Structure 1
Amino acid sequence: LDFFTIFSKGGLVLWCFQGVSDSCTGPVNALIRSVLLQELTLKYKLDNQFELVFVVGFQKILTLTYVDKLIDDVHRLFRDKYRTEIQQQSALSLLNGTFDFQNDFLRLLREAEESSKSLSREDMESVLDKMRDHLIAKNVAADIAVQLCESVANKLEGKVMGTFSTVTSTVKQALQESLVQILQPQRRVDMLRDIMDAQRRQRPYVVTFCGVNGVGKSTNLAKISFWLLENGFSVLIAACDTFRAGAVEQLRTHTRRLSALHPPEKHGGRTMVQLFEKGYGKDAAGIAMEAIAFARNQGFDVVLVDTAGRMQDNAPLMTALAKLITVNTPDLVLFVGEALVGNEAVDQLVKFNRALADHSMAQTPRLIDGIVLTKFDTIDDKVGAAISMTYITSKPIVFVGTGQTYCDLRSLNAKAVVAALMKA
Structure 2
Amino acid sequence: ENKQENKRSFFDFLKYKTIKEDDLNDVIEELRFQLLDSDVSYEVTEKILEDLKNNLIGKKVSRREEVEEIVINTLKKSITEILTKNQKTDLIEKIRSSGKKPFVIIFFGVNGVGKTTTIAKVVNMLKKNNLSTIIAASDTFRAAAQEQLAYHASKLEVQLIRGKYGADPASVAFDAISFAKSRNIDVVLIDTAGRMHIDSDLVEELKRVLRIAKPDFRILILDSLAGSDALEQARHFENNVGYDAVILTKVDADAKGGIALSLAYELKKPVVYMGVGQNYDDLIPFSPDWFVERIFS
> TM over 0.5, yes or no?
yes
Cα distance between partner residues in 1 of 2:266 and 2:143: 35
Cα offsets for 1:361-388 (capped at 9, x unmatched): xxxxxx3222222223323335422441
Q: Does 1:225 align with 2:116?
A: no
Which consecutive residues of structure 1, in runs of 5 or more, have no partner in the other structure?
1-88, 90-117, 165-171, 260-272, 357-366
| Counterparts in 2 of 1:193 and 1:186: CA distance versus 1, 3 Å | closer
- Aligned equivalent of 1:401: 275
SS at match of 2:291: helix
Say yes or no: does 1:182 pair with 2:67. Answer: no
Verify the 8 A CA contact 2:80 2:86 in the aligned structure 1: no
Q: In 2 relative to 1, CA 133–312 (structure 1 residues): closer, same or farther, beyond 3 Å?
A: farther
Distance of 1:130 and 1:193 partners within structure 2: 39
Contact 1:238–1:276 under 8 Å retained in 2:
yes
Q: 1:283 to 1:386 in 2, by over 3 A?
A: farther
1:353 correspondence with 2:238: yes
The secondary structure found in structure 2 opposite 1:182 is helix
Q: Which amino acid aligns with 1:277?
A: R
Whole-angstrom CA distance in 1 between matches of 2:125 and 2:79: 30
Deviation at 1:196, TM superposition (A): 4.4
> 1:132, 1:229 → 2: CA distance?
38
The reply on whether 1:204 has 2:102 as its aligned counterpart is yes
In structure 1, which of residues 133, 136, 147 is the aligned counterpart of residue 43 of structure 2?
147
TM-score relative to the length of structure 1: 0.52
2:164 match: 279
> CA–CA distance in 2 between the matches of 1:179 and 1:194?
22
Verify the 8 A CA contact 1:209 1:304 in the aligned structure 2: yes
The C-alpha deviation readout for 1:296-319, integer Å capped at 9, x for no partner, is 122211111111223555133223
- Taking the aligned partners of 2:289 and 2:57, their CA distance within structure 1 comes to 26
Structure of higher CA gyration radius: 1
What CA deviation, in whole Å up to 9, does each residue of 1:326-367 have, x standing for no partner? 5533222121122332332322212221222xxxxxxxxxx3
The question of whether the paired residues in 2 share the 8 Å contact of 1:148 and 1:178 is answered with no
What does residue range 294-333 of structure 1 map to in structure 2 within 5 Å?
Answer: 294-311=179-196, 313-325=198-210, 328-333=213-218
Partners of 2:270 and 2:111 in 1: CA distance? 21
In 2: Cα distance, 1:253 partner to 1:152 partner: 43
2 CA distance for matches of 1:279 and 1:420? Answer: 45
Could you tell me which residue of structure 2 aligns to residue 50 of structure 1?
none
Deviations 1:163-215 (A, max 9, x none): 99xxxxxxx999956444323423214466544444x35x2011111112112
Number of matched pairs: 266
Match of 1:369 in 2: 244
Q: Contact between 2:87 and 2:270, CA under 8 Å: does it hold in 1? A: yes
Q: Is the contact made by 1:312 and 1:318 (CA closer than 8 Å) also made in structure 2?
A: no
TM-score (norm: length of structure 2): 0.72
Whether 1:256 and 2:133 are equivalent positions in the alignment is no
Partner of 2:264: 389
Aligned counterpart, 1:344: 229
Quick one: distance in 2 between partners of 1:284 and 1:178? 40
Secondary structure at 1:282 match in 2: coil
SS at match of 1:347: helix
The answer on whether the counterparts of 1:124 and 1:153 sit within 8 Å (CA) in structure 2 is no
Task: Name the CA shift for 1:222/1:420 in 2 (closer, same or farther; >3 Å).
Answer: closer
Aligned position for 1:25: none
Choose from 137, 145, 148 the match for 1:239.
137
More helix by share: 2
User: Which one scores higher on RCO, CA 8 angstroms, separation ≥ 6?
Assistant: 2
- Give the residue type in structure 1 aligned to 2:188: V
Listed one character per residue, the Cα deviations across residues 37-64 of structure 1 (whole Å, up to 9, x for unaligned) are xxxxxxxxxxxxxxxxxxxxxxxxxxxx
Tell me the CA shift for residue 279 of structure 1: 2.0
Question: Are the counterparts in 2 of residues 131 and 149 from structure 1 also a CA contact under 8 Å?
Answer: no
The whole-number CA distance in structure 2 between the counterparts of 1:129 and 1:229 is 42
**Preserved CA contact (<8 Å) 1:187 1:396:** no
- Tell me which amino acid in the other structure corresponds to 1:234: S
Match of 1:214, as an amino acid? Answer: G
Give the Cα–Cα distance (whole angstroms) in 2 for the partners of residues 210 and 224 of structure 1. Answer: 14
Provide the aligned C-alpha RMSD in A.
3.8
Q: Distance between the aligned counterparts of 1:258 and 1:160, measured in 2?
A: 52
2:181 and 2:218 map into 1 onto residues whose CA distance is 19
Give the secondary structure class of the aligned counterpart of 1:246. Answer: helix
- Rounded Cα–Cα distance in structure 2 between residues aligned with 1:148 and 1:386: 8
Counterpart CA distance in 1 for 2:211 and 2:265 is 22
Task: For 1:318 and 1:128, locate their aligned partners in 2 and report how far apart those are by CA, in whole Å.
Answer: 43
